[PDB]
Every structure is written in C-alpha cells, then in structure tokens.
Amino acid sequence: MHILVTGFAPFDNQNINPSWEAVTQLEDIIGTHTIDKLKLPTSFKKVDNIINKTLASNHYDVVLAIGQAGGRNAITPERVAINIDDARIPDNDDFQPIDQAIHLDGAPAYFSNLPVKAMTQSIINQGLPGALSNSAGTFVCNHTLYHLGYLQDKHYPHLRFGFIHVPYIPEQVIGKPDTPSMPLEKIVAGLTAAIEAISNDEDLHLALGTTE
C-alpha cells in the first residue's frame, strides 16, 4: 500500500510541531507500506487544495494525517470528523472560522475507514499510551480529516483515510504547568506501530470505546 503521511507546520506561537517532527523520523517503508511524507500548512484555506492536488498527481491507497493535540497524554487515532470549523485561535494565515460548515454538500460527519481500533491497539501492544479518540477537535486537524472523508465519499471511493493526534513533545511545555508531553521517540514508535496495522481488512471490534 502506498501511503501519504502528513504532518502540520508549527502554530500558536510554537516553533515546532510534533506531528511533522514524528513524520520526518518514520522509515520510508513500514512492512509492506511505502511512505511518502508531506508537510501541510496549518491553514484552513490551503489544506484542502494541497490534498486535492497531491491526490491528482500521485496514486495513494491511504492518506494518514498526523497532528498535534496539545494537552493529550496518549497517541490517538481518530474515529470521526464533523462538518464544522470552529477555531479557538486564528490559523497561520490569521484566519479564524467560527461555526462554519466545511462542505455544505457533505455529510454531517465522516467516519475514518482505516482500522482505527487495530491501530490503537497496536500502539498499546508496544507499551505506549494509546486511545481511540471520538473528536478530532474543530481546528485544522478535524478540517483535514473531514475533507478526506468528503473526498472518499464524492470522488475517491477506494481511498482509505484517517488521522492520528499526538501529544506535545517535551520541549513544547516549558511555561505550561501540569501539561502532558511525550518523548518524540515514543511518538515515532507509536505511529510506526499504527501504520503497521493498516490494511484493507475489517477493523478489530475491541472494547476501546469511551465510557464516562
């Protein structure tokens, strides 16, 4: 399987983004998966066009987008994206969409069609903190996952797509009391395990739901 793996540019006054840092360190072949890496701007207006053009110029079986989830304490594949942008802060283009539909002709939500539970458990099997997240937020990451789901619905029926959020890396939490982080090497190991678990087979129906 030929996989496009993306990471995001630094944003919110950070000079580094763990998603891209981790992606840079991935092996170029992980098992039978061949990996192409792409750095996306943290930009609501630019991301969809970059994805569109990239899929138009190259054949990918899978698009797996990685992002920073500052404050999370686990590596978390995402189950679902929702059809709204609601930016707490502006993006890197100083654009702050609030309560805006992403695609008016799209579904209210799209579920990832990667084996998200297999990927989550693969992280856990390596002894790393992993969990299946049920919200990708309402910033550029959710927007990207949503757009991938919209493309699979409307234009690319066989495309497999998903998103994995990762914690801050340690250097990012100076001056942020009680904020979790995870060493970059661990993030890379977890992402590697998740990618290894990617296939066209049915997901694992493990007890990985979130129960309050």
Give the active site residues: 78, 141, 165
CA 1 – CA 116 distance, rounded (Å)? 17
Q: Which of residues 48-67 bind Zn ion (CB under 5 A)?
A: 67
Query: Is residue 141 near Zn ion by the rule CB under 5 A?
Result: yes
Asked if residue 115 lies in contact with residue 132, where contact means CB atoms within 8 angstroms, the answer is no
- Which of the choices its own copies, Zn ion, none does residue 207 contact, using the CB cut-off of 5 to 8 A by kind? its own copies
CA 149 – CA 98 distance, rounded (Å)? 21
CA atoms within 13 A on the CB side of 181: 17
Q: Between 10 and 49, how does the x/- string for binding to Zn ion read (CB under 5 A)?
A: ----------------------------------------
Minimum distance of its own copies from residue 59's CB (angstroms):
27
CB nearer to its own copies: give 98 or 170.
98
CB nearer to Zn ion: give 141 or 159.
141
What 8-state DSSP symbol labels residue 124? H
- Inter-axis angle of helices 184-196 and 116-125, nearest 10: 130
CB nearer to its own copies: give 60 or 139.
139
Q: In the complex, which residues of this chain contact its own copies (CB under 8 A)? A: 12, 67-72, 79-80, 82-89, 96, 98-99, 107-111, 133-139, 141, 165, 203, 205-212
Which spans in 38-196 are helix H? Answer: 44-57, 116-125, 140-154, 184-196
